[PDB]
From Swiss-Prot, chain B:
The modification Phosphoserine is found at residue 3. Belongs to the WD repeat gemin-5 family. It is linked to Neurodevelopmental disorder with cerebellar atrophy and motor dysfunction: An autosomal recessive disorder characterized by global developmental delay with predominantly motor abnormalities, axial hypotonia with decreased or absent reflexes, gait ataxia and appendicular spasticity. Affected individuals have cognitive impairment and speech delay. Brain imaging shows cerebellar atrophy. It is found in: Nucleus, Nucleoplasm; Nucleus, Gem; Cytoplasm. The SMN complex catalyzes the assembly of small nuclear ribonucleoproteins (snRNPs), the building blocks of the spliceosome, and thereby plays an important role in the splicing of cellular pre-mRNAs. Most spliceosomal snRNPs contain a common set of Sm proteins SNRPB, SNRPD1, SNRPD2, SNRPD3, SNRPE, SNRPF and SNRPG that assemble in a heptameric protein ring on the Sm site of the small nuclear RNA to form the core snRNP (Sm core). Part of the core SMN complex that contains SMN1, GEMIN2/SIP1, DDX20/GEMIN3, GEMIN4, GEMIN5, GEMIN6, GEMIN7, GEMIN8 and STRAP/UNRIP. Part of the SMN-Sm complex that contains SMN1, GEMIN2/SIP1, DDX20/GEMIN3, GEMIN4, GEMIN5, GEMIN6, GEMIN7, GEMIN8, STRAP/UNRIP and the Sm proteins SNRPB, SNRPD1, SNRPD2, SNRPD3, SNRPE, SNRPF and SNRPG. Interacts with GEMIN2; the interaction is direct. Interacts with SMN1, SNRPB, SNRPD1, SNRPD2, SNRPD3 and SNRPE; the interaction is direct. Interacts with cytosolic DDX20/GEMIN3 and GEMIN4. Interacts with SNRNP70 and HNRNPU. The chain holds residues 845 to 1095 of 1508 of the full protein. Changing residue 73 to F: In NEDCAM; uncertain significance. Changing residue 167 to E: In NEDCAM; uncertain significance. Changing residue 61 to R: In NEDCAM; impaired function in spliceosomal snRNP assembly; decreased protein abundance; decreased protein stability; decreased interaction with DDX20; decreased interaction with GEMIN4. The gene is GEMIN5. This is Gem-associated protein 5. It comes from Homo sapiens (Human). The WD repeat domain mediates binding to U1 snRNA and to U4 snRNA. The WD repeat domain also mediates binding to the 7-methylguanosine cap that is found both on mRNA and snRNA molecules. The regions that bind snRNA molecules and the isolated 7-methylguanosine cap overlap at least partially. Besides, the WD repeat domain mediates interaction with the 60S large ribosomal subunit.
């Protein structure tokens, strides 16, 4: 694992001449934050100097493109709510950061998950964002997100597993997905959606839109199973016509 | 962004023959007042058949070895408590899982943070393990975990940041680290530990153990700064002997 104090570790592993200067400055500092150059003494001096050292180390992690290490270091200082607010602003929120957010209370975790969710939408991870909105008990909001971004399959699975079977939302997903597929010429899959919404007539009709013989036969058999025999006959007729 | 429903998605993308048989099988099912081979139909039928499909999909993920996607599917079923217990028993906990644990209650997150720390130690990620112990307000346990694993540098950084200057645990860290540095011959670094513990008298002695002209010299000036003038002279005259 990568160390969180590499700069200070380097200045502690240098010449014996350099080490001896540290003892004398530190000794004078103890007789009472005195030094300026030797920031790495904050490990042995006082908290105000330790924080100085940490800030230098954190900023150093940033300049190497390691914001994860910056954030993991700022937790030690104790300002979790401040790190999260900064992490959200920078778009560097992560699972590890959200895992520790409840340390400030349930209300800070709620804020963090929403923040991490909004950010995850920008990062093109709508399914992961959907899971996090589920974690804060926002099932409808999570489902509307996936639907809005054309993740109909995953949205239906979330809506079917959490909502009562007759929820108009669950039905609207089948419809909303069906129309879209109908639009783009996927009549077979569209029928499955209309069937899922308990709309058997429309399931048979969209399947008839393809026009071929196989589609019209199955569409007829589908209408017979359901009990719309008048339509099943009408589609059975249209099936035999194509074969001529 | 790997899909969470590979197997079912694959079956839905098949020849027109297959989707037509699906429609027939599906129409029969919906017409029910009171199927198996087509597990992918659970998305369109009922919750009981959906769960069956998810379980099949989760089984496929565990065969693939991608448990983070196995975890997403179980959150959908509303089985977060179950999958947390499962991932703990198998050592598959993640930051993702702990980030969602509060969904099952504040005390489940508190439980998951502990099990994730115990797991991170097994995997020898002690600084991360300690950081997560700080999230549940266990400072002394995080400091003792790092100390006991020879992470004195990080153990002091946390103690100094969270504990008070006169906390006995902070002094014992400095002394404990110095004892190890002195045992290995790192005499200059050992002095700073003793100085960090407000043991200037013992810090000058250790710096003299080195024995060369520069060590005794600095050790003598160090004792002078403190006010241990009796000792300062003793070392500055041994400094002369070397010269």
């Amino acid at each position: 694992a990568r160390s969180l104090l590499p700069l200070s570790t380097s200045l502690d592993h240098r010449s014996k001449e350099e080490l001896h200067q540290d003892c004398l400055v530190l000794a004078t500092a103890k007789h009472s934050r005195d030094v300026e150059e030797r920031f790495h003494l904050g490990l042995f001096t006082d908290r105000a100097t330790l924080y100085r050292m940490i800030d230098i180390e954190g900023k150093g992690h940033l300049e190497n493109g390691h914001p994860e290490l910056f954030h993991q270091l700022m937790l030690w200082k104790g300002d979790l709510k401040g790190v999260l607010q900064t992490a959200a602003e920078r778009g560097e929120l992560t699972d590890n950061l959200v895992a520790m957010a409840p340390a400030a209370g349930y209300h800070v975790w709620l804020w963090a998950v929403e923040a991490f969710a909004k950010q995850l939408c920008f990062q093109d991870q709508y399914v992961k964002a959907a899971s996090h909105l589920l974690s804060i008990h926002k099932v409808y909001e999570a489902v509307e997100l996936l639907k809005s971004n054309h993740f109909y399959r995953e949205a239906i699975a979330i809506a079917k597993a959490r909502l009562r079977p007759e929820d108009p939302v669950l039905k609207d997903l089948y419809l909303s997905w069906g129309t879209v597929l109908e639009r783009d010429g996927h009549y077979a899959v569209a029928a499955k959606c209309y069937l899922g919404a308990t709309c058997a007539y429309d399931a048979a009709k969209v399947l008839a839109k393809k026009g071929d013989a196989a589609s019209l036969r199955t569409a007829a058999e589908l209408a017979a199973i359901v009990g719309e025999d008048e339509l099943s006959a009408s589609l059975a007729l249209r099936c035999a016509q194509e074969l001529l």
